[PDB]
Amino acid sequence: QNAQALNTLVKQLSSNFGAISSVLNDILSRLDPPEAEVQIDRLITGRL
Amino acid sequence: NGLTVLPPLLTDEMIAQYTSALLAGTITSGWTFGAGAALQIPFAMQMAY
Amino acid sequence: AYTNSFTRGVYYPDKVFRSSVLHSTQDLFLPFFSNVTWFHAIHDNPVLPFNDGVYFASTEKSNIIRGWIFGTTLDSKTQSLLIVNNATNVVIKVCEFQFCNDPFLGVNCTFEYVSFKNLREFVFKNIDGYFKIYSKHTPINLVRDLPQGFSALEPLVDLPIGINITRFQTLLALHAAYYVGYLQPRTFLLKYNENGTITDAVDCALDPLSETKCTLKSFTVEKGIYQTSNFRVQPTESIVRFPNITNLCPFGEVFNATRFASVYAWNRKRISNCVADYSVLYNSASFSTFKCYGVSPTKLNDLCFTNVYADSFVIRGDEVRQIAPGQTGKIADYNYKLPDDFTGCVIAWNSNNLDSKGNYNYLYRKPFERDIYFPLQSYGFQPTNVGYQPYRVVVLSFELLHAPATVCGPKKSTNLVKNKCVNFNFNGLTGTGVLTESNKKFLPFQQFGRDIADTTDAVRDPQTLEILDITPCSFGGVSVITPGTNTSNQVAVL
Amino acid sequence: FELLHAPATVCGPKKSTNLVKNKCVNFNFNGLTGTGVLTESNKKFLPFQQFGRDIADTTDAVRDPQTLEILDITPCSFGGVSVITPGTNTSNQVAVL
Ligand SMILES: *[C@@H]1O[C@H](CO)[C@@H](O)[C@H](O)[C@H]1NC(C)=O
Ligand SMILES: *[C@@H]1O[C@H](CO)[C@@H](O)[C@H](O)[C@H]1NC(C)=O
Ligand SMILES: *[C@@H]1O[C@H](CO)[C@@H](O)[C@H](O)[C@H]1NC(C)=O
Ligand SMILES: *[C@@H]1O[C@H](CO)[C@@H](O)[C@H](O)[C@H]1NC(C)=O
Ligand SMILES: *[C@@H]1O[C@H](CO)[C@@H](O)[C@H](O)[C@H]1NC(C)=O
Ligand SMILES: *[C@@H]1O[C@H](CO)[C@@H](O)[C@H](O)[C@H]1NC(C)=O
Ligand SMILES: *[C@@H]1O[C@H](CO)[C@@H](O)[C@H](O)[C@H]1NC(C)=O
Ligand SMILES: *[C@@H]1O[C@H](CO)[C@@H](O)[C@H](O)[C@H]1NC(C)=O
Numbered sequence: 001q002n003a004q005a006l007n008t009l010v011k012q013l014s015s016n017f018g019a020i021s022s023v024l025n026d027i028l029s030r031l032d033p034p035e036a037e038v039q040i041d042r043l044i045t046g047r048l
Numbered sequence: 049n050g051l052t053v054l055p056p057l058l059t060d061e062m063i064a065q066y067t068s069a070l071l072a073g074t075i076t077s078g079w080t081f082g083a084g085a086a087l088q089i090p091f092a093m094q095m096a097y
Numbered sequence: 098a099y100t101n102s103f104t105r106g107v108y109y110p111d112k113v114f115r116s117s118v119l120h121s122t123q124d125l126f127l128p129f130f131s132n133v134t135w136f137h138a139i140h141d142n143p144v145l146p147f148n149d150g151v152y153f154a155s156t157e158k159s160n161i162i163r164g165w166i167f168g169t170t171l172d173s174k175t176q177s178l179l180i181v182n183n184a185t186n187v188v189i190k191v192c193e194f195q196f197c198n199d200p201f202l203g204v205n206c207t208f209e210y211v212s213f214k215n216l217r218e219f220v221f222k223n224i225d226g227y228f229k230i231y232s233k234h235t236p237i238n239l240v241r242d243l244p245q246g247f248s249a250l251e252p253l254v255d256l257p258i259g260i261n262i263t264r265f266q267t268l269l270a271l272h273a274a275y276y277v278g279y280l281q282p283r284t285f286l287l288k289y290n291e292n293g294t295i296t297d298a299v300d301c302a303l304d305p306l307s308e309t310k311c312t313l314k315s316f317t318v319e320k321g322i323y324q325t326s327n328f329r330v331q332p333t334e335s336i337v338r339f340p341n342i343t344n345l346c347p348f349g350e351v352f353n354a355t356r357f358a359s360v361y362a363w364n365r366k367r368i369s370n371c372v373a374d375y376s377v378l379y380n381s382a383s384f385s386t387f388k389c390y391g392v393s394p395t396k397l398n399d400l401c402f403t404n405v406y407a408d409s410f411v412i413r414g415d416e417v418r419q420i421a422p423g424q425t426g427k428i429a430d431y432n433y434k435l436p437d438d439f440t441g442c443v444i445a446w447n448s449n450n451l452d453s454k455g456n457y458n459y460l461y462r463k464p465f466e467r468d469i470y471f472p473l474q475s476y477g478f479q480p481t482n483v484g485y486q487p488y489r490v491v492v493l494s495f496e497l498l499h500a501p502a503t504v505c506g507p508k509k510s511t512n513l514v515k516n517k518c519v520n521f522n523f524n525g526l527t528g529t530g531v532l533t534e535s536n537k538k539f540l541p542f543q544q545f546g547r548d549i550a551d552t553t554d555a556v557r558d559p560q561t562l563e564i565l566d567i568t569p570c571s572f573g574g575v576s577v578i579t580p581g582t583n584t585s586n587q588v589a590v591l
Numbered sequence: 592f593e594l595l596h597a598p599a600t601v602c603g604p605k606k607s608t609n610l611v612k613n614k615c616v617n618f619n620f621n622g623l624t625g626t627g628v629l630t631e632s633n634k635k636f637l638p639f640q641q642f643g644r645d646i647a648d649t650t651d652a653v654r655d656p657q658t659l660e661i662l663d664i665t666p667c668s669f670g671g672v673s674v675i676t677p678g679t680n681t682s683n684q685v686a687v688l
Binding site: 109112113114115116252292293 | 595596597598634635637638640641643644646651652
Binding site: 011023 | 391392393395396399497525526527528549550551552
C-alpha cells in the first residue's frame with residue numbers, strides 16, 4: 001500500500017492539469033513570465 | 049523529486065535484541081520479569097503454573 | 098580596517114504597527130556578524146560601491162560627518178543626490194553638482210529641500226528609483242568601535258529621485274570613524290514587544306540554531322532534532338549543446354518572395370537542417386503583426402524544433418484576425434484552418450504597395466487542409482481600398498516534440514563536462530544535474546529518455562552521438578540536533 | 592499609483608463625516624473600508640505608521656487622518672445561533688441560544 005501510494009504520487013508529476021506541459025522547465029523555456037505564470041499555477045494547483 | 053525515506057530508530061538488530069530479551073525472560077522466569085525482577089523457575093514448573 | 102556588524106542594521110520594514118508578536122520579514126538588511134569596512138577621521142572619504150544597498154553608521158563627538166553623495170560618477174556629468182547637515186539645517190539636493198576632486202566641508206536640478214558620545218545609524222537603498230532612508234540616533238560611551246547591541250531604525254525619508262546609484266561618498270567637516278556595510282536579501286525573525294518596539298532579532302542564514310529559530314518562529318528552542326532546511330548541491334557552469342551546423346534558414350525566400358500564393362491554394366515550405374535566427378523577423382519593423390500563440394517570440398533563439406513550416410498566402414486585411422487557434426469565420430472555417438492547439442507565430446504585413454494594382458490573381462474558398470453557384474470567390478486588390486488592402490501572411494508552425502531537432506537558433510555551444518553538477522541545455526531542453534557516461538542503448542531514432550515522473554532520464558549528445566545519464570546532484574534534509582536554549586546555543590547538523 | 596498602506600497624500604474627491612466612537616459603524620479611512628466599533632486606544636503607533644494589522648492581515652487599528660489619534664477596531668458582536676427545541680411532534684415552542 002505504501003509503495004502504491006508513492007508510485008501514484010510520482011506518476012502525478014507527468015500530468016498536465018490543464019497546462020501546456022507537465023514539465024516545468026518546458027513551460028519556463030518557452031513562455032515569458034506573464035504567460036508562464038498562468039501555466040505554472042495550473043501545475044501548482046494540481047501538484048499541491 | 050523530493051521523496052525520501054527515513055530509517056527507523058530501532059534497527060532490525062535492536063528489535064532482535066528486544067525479542068530475545070522478552071523470550072529469554074519468558075523461558076527462564078515466566079511472568080515474574082513482567083511484574084518486577086526476573087525470578088528464575090525450572091521450566092517444567094513454569095508450565096505447571 | 099574591518100569590524101563586526103553584530104546585531105546592528107535592522108529597521109522597521111513597513112508602516113504596519115505590531116506588538117507582542119514574533120513576526121518574520123524578508124528585506125535588504127545587514128547580515129548579522131558579517132564584516133563592515135571601518136574608516137577613520139583622525140590625524141578618509143573614498144568612493145565606495147553602493148551595490149544592492151548600504152548600511153552606514155558613524156560615531157561622533159563633534160558632528161564631523163555632515164553629508165553624503167550618491168551617483169555613478171559624482172562629477173557633474175550625472176545627477177547626484179547630496180545630503181548636508183550644517184548646524185541646524187538639513188539640506189537635500191539632487192543637482193548635477195560639480196564636486197571637488199576631493200570633496201569636503203571646511204569649519205538640471207529635479208529636487209530641493211531645506212529644514213564617542215553619539216551613534217548615528219542609517220540605511221540607504223534604491224528600489225525602482227526610490228531612495229529610502231532609515232535612521233536611528235542613540236547616545237553612546239565608546240570610542241574604539243561600534244557598540245554591541247540591538248535597537249531598530251524607523252523610516253524617515255523616501256525620495257523619488259529616479260537616479261541610478263552605483264557609488265557613493267561621504268562628506269567630512271575639517272578644521273569621527275564611520276562604517277560601511279552591504280545590505281543583502283536575508284529573511285529575519287523580529288521580536289516586537291508590548292510597546293511594539295523590535296527588542297530582538299534572528300538572521301535566518303547566520304547559523305543552524307538561527308535557522309531553527311527561523312523555522313519554529315521562536316527565540317527559545319526546545320531540546321530535539323528539527324528539519325530546518327533541505328541541502329541541495331549547486332551547479333558550477335552551464336553546458337550548451339546544439340548540432341554544429343552553420344547553414345542559415347531561408348526565411349528571406351518566404352518573406353521576400355516575388356509572389357505569394359492564394360489562400361485557397363496556400364504554400365507550405367519546409368524549413369530544416371539550418372540555423373534559425375528569429376531576431377531578424379521579430380526586430381524588423383516591416384511587420385504589421387507578429388503574434389505568437391505557441392511560445393514567446395524572444396525564446397525562439399534558445400528553443401529549437403524538429404521541423405518548421407511556413408504557410409504562405411494572401412488574404413484581405415480584416416481577415417488577419419481569423420488566422421489563430423480558437424477562431425471561426427468564413428476564412429478560419431472555409432479556406433485556412435489552424436489547429437486549436439497550434440504552436441507557433443502568425444506574421445503579416447500589407448502588400449498595398451506591391452500586390453495591389455486591380456489585382457485579381459488572389460482567390461479564396463480540417464487543420465492544414467488545402468482545398469484545391471460556386472464556393473469560389475476572389476478579390477480585386479487596389480491601392481486605394483486599410484481593411485480592404487491585401488496582406489501577406491506567413492504562418493510559422495513549429496514542431497517541439499522531443500525528437501532530434503533539425504532547426505536550432507543562433508546560439509553557440511560550449512564544451513561538455515562530465516561527472517560534475519552542471520546547468521545543461523540540450524537542444525532547448527534544460528535542467529540541472531550530473532552528466533555521466535551510460536550504457537543505455539538508445540535506438541537510432543531516439544533522442545531523449547524519460548523516467549516515471551516524465552523527467553529526463555538520459556540524453557543523446559546532439560554533436561557526438563553518445564548517451565549521457567542525468568542523475569540530480571546529491572541532496573537531502575538538513576536537521577539540527579540541539580539541547581534546549583536554556584542549556585546551550587551549541588548545535589550539531591545532520 | 593502607489594496604494595501601499597501608508598499615509599495618503601492624494602485622496603479622492605469625497606467629503607468626510609464626523610467620527611462616532613463606541614458604536615458599530617461602516618468605516619472608510621483613506622479608502623480602507625470595513626465594519627467595526629471604533630474605540631480609543633493605547634497603541635503607540637510610531638509617527639510613520641498609519642495602519643496596524645492582526646495575524647489574519649486584517650486591520651487592527653488605524654490613525655485618524657484628520658486628527659492623529661489611534662483608534663482600535665473591534666468587529667461588531669457576532670456568534671452562532673442555536674435553536675433549542677423539543678421535537679415538533681410535541682411542541683412548536685423554541686428557545687434561542
Ligand atoms: C571578516 O574579516 C576577517 C579578517 O579580519 C576574516 O578572517 C573573516 O573571514 C571575514 N568574514 C567575512 C564573513 O567576510
Ligand atoms: C547650509 O548650506 C546652505 C547652502 O546649501 C546655506 O544657504 C546655509 O546658509 C548653510 N547653513 C545655515 C546654518 O544656514
Ligand atoms: C540638461 O539636460 C539636457 C538634456 O535634456 C542637456 O542637453 C543639457 O546640457 C543639461 N544641462 C547641463 C547644464 O548640463
Ligand atoms: C514600554 O514603555 C514603557 C514606558 O512607557 C516602559 O516602562 C516599558 O518598560 C516599555 N516596555 C514594554 C512594556 O514593552
Ligand atoms: C527582406 O528584405 C529586407 C530588405 O529590404 C531585409 O531587411 C529583411 O531582413 C528580409 N527578410 C528576411 C526574412 O530575410
Ligand atoms: C559535430 O562536429 C564533428 C566534427 O568535430 C562532426 O564529425 C559531427 O558530425 C558534427 N555533428 C553534427 C550533429 O553535425
Ligand atoms: C484637520 O483640520 C484641523 C483643524 O480643525 C487641522 O488642525 C488639522 O491639521 C487637519 N488635518 C490634516 C491632516 O490636514
Ligand atoms: C407524532 O404525530 C403523529 C401525527 O402526525 C401521531 O400520529 C403520532 O402518534 C405522534 N407520535 C408521537 C411519539 O408523539
